[PDB]
Design a protein around this ligand. Structure first.
Ligand SMILES: CC(=O)N[C@@H]1[C@@H](O)[C@H](O[C@@H]2O[C@H](CO)[C@@H](O)[C@H](O)[C@H]2NC(C)=O)[C@@H](CO)O[C@@H]1O
Ligand SMILES: [Cl-]
Ligand SMILES: [Cl-]
Ligand SMILES: [Cl-]
Ligand SMILES: [Cl-]
Ligand SMILES: [Cl-]
Ligand code: NA
Ligand code: NA
Length: 129
């Protein structure tokens, strides 16, 4: 599924990401925009052979099991394919674990490089939330 911006904002808000660990909703929408272009089916292979999955491009090195990232962890205790669902619950719940792990949203490279320190509220501007 390719979410609309506000649609995703609303879904993320319903799933408790607004101000989750102090990260306003726009952070999450911004991260999703630049990680996946709001596409739940996005996958990208990393240099180490892990793959990033889903709307928040959660990687299989640490967070999910894709059966092809040897020596990796599965800290969200999910098949990575669950992160490709049109239902973002699994991604959100995993993202909550990630962002809670001490490094905040810096785990999301795109967020660090493209959202952090920007006016992320712009990402939820105009949305009915
Ligand atoms: C939370 C999450 O999974 N974020 C992804 C990053 O982990 C990806 O960064 C890449 O992660 C792999 C596995 O840890 C690293 O081996 C790799 O060096 C790292 N790549 C960079 C440029 O830091 C990122 C890839 O675009 O995608 C999500 O942000
Ligand atoms: Cl867009
Ligand atoms: Cl915001
Ligand atoms: Cl694996
Ligand atoms: Cl959803
Ligand atoms: Cl933080
Ligand atoms: Na990425
Ligand atoms: Na894994």
């Amino acid at each position: 599924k390719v979410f609309g911006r506000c649609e995703l904002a609303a879904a993320m808000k319903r799933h408790g990401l607004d101000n989750y660990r102090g990260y306003s909703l726009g952070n999450w929408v911004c991260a999703a925009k630049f990680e996946s272009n709001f596409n739940t089916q996005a996958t990208n292979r990393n240099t180490d052979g892990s793959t990033d999955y889903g709307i928040l491009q959660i990687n299989s090195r640490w967070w999910c099991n894709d059966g092809r990232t040897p020596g990796s962890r599965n800290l969200c205790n999910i098949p990575c394919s669950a992160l490709l669902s049109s239902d973002i619950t699994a991604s959100v719940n995993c993202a909550k674990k990630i962002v809670s792990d001490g490094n905040g949203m810096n785990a999301w490279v795109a967020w660090r490089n493209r959202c952090k320190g920007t006016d992320v509220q712009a990402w939820i501007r105009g949305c009915r939330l």
